[PDB]
Amino acid sequence: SANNPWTGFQIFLSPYYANEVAAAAKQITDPTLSSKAASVANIPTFTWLDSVAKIPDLGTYLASASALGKSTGTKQLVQIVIYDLPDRDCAAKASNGEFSIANNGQANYENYIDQIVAQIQQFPDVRVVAVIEPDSLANLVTNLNVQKCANAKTTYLASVNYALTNLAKVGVYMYMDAGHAGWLGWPANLSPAAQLFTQVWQNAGKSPFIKGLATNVANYNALQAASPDPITQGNPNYDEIHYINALAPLLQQAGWDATFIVDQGRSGVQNIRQQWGDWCNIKGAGFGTRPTTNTGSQFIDSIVWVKPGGESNGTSNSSSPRYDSTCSLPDAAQPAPEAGTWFQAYFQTLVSAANPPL
Ligand SMILES: *[C@@H]1O[C@H](CO)[C@@H](O[C@@H]2O[C@H](CO)[C@@H](O)[C@H](O)[C@H]2NC(C)=O)[C@H](O)[C@H]1NC(C)=O
Structure with missing residues (x-):
């Protein structure tokens, strides 16, 4: 599209991830690998607002970015994930979300959004890009047979709508999570997915700040695979570029010339999964292609x-x-620690197996 949110901006580097990386790198004993690990702190990542407790951090990042920009002559951009739906991760065997539908989930989530908007409103010289609710809408395409998902459907739709509608009021550029090629990229799932995302976009007023969709978030698929991973058998859309090429025209027909962003943070090593749906701490993953607007695709x-x-x-x-x-x-x-806690051995292998190398 004409307006790529990243062009002309300096990405703010998470100091939290930077602190995790710095502490991790000093424990890596091989000196050459330790220096490569430390450099990961210079690679931009998204900040996950996975609880209300993360909102004060967001405020600090916006204020820090505003000052770094003035100190360097740059316009700064802060990257966030909105990830706190009630009954979050409906199809998972376990979820860490702090809100429940049964305990005023909708009002609590709205207040979470309101607190985020209230921070963003104070720093208008900082651009914000948000990924909206990984592991949410995609469940409403394929997993309505999961009773927790069926029962969460109206709340997910209402809460995502509230996020899109209110973050648009402060000019946040937004990409709705859209699973990955092995979830919504199956040809038969493309049209149901397009229909759902279009309804969501319509309900939020078709705001131009709703740029499109994010894919492969927290996953491991190739953007453009050298050859199909065996986990993909039966799906002609075996990588993210095939998925996006197939989905984008369906969105265009609705009047939404959508664009996409693709997670490659753990995509450096392909052919590491037994089944495509295996998502947790996949062994042997490596850091993948570094963030860039040089994407190889009109849609990305x-x-x-x-x-x-x-x-x-x-x-x-x-x-x-x-x-x-x-x-x-x-x-x-394995053994793997609790979600969100640092997994040092996994990080060291992400560094060692990085492709391209660090
Ligand atoms: C594995 O999970 C169990 C249950 O959460 C942990 O065992 C408990 O640990 C807490 C303190 O961390 C104690 O209050 C409980 O009494 C423990 N229960 C038992 C049966 O030991 C266990 O620590 C966890 N193991 C690891 C490596 O995290």
Whole structure:
């Protein structure tokens, strides 16, 4: 499109991820690998606002970005993930979301959005790009047979709508999460997905700030695979470019000339999964293509690193109340600590296996 949110901006580098990376790098014993690991702190990632407790951090990042821009003559851009739906992750065996539909989820989520908007409103010289609710709308395409998802459908739609409508009022550029090629990219899922995303876009007023969709968030697919990963058999859309090329024209027909961003933060190593749906701490993952607007596609505004590499996707300990058995599969790195906590061995392998190399 004419307006790529990243062009002309300096991306703000997360100091939190930077702090995690710095602490991790000093524990890597091989000196050459340690220096490569430390440099990961210079690679832009998205900040996950996975609870209300993260909102004060957002405020600090906006204010810091505003000052860094003035100190360097740059316009700064802060990258965030909106990730706090009530009954979050409806199809997962376990979820860490703090809100529940049964306990005023809609009002609590609205207040979470209001607090985020109130921060963003104070720093108008900082641009914000937001990924909207990973692991939400995609469940409403394929997983309505999951009772928790069926029962969450109206709340997910209302809450996502509230986020889109209100973040647009402060000029946030937004990409709705849209799963990945092995979820919504199956040819038979493309039209139901397009119909749902279009309805969501319409309900939020077709705001020009709703730029399009984010794909492969927290996943491992290639953007453009050298050859199809065996997990993809049966799906001609075996990588993200095939998925996006197939979905984008369906959105165009609705009047939404959508553009896309694609997570490649853990895509450096292909052919590491037994089944396509295995998502938790996949063993042998490597850092992938660094964020760039040089995407190879008319539809793709940026390759991005949405999910921060090194933060555990979930514990492998079956005695934890947050245990999801996906995290103990044979292709999941184990033992793995609780979701969000640092997984040092996994980070070291992400560095060692990076492709392109760091
Ligand atoms: C695996 O999960 C279990 C349950 O969460 C953990 O065992 C408990 O740990 C807490 C303190 O961390 C104690 O209050 C409980 O009494 C423990 N229960 C038992 C049966 O030991 C266990 O620590 C976890 N293991 C790892 C490596 O995280």
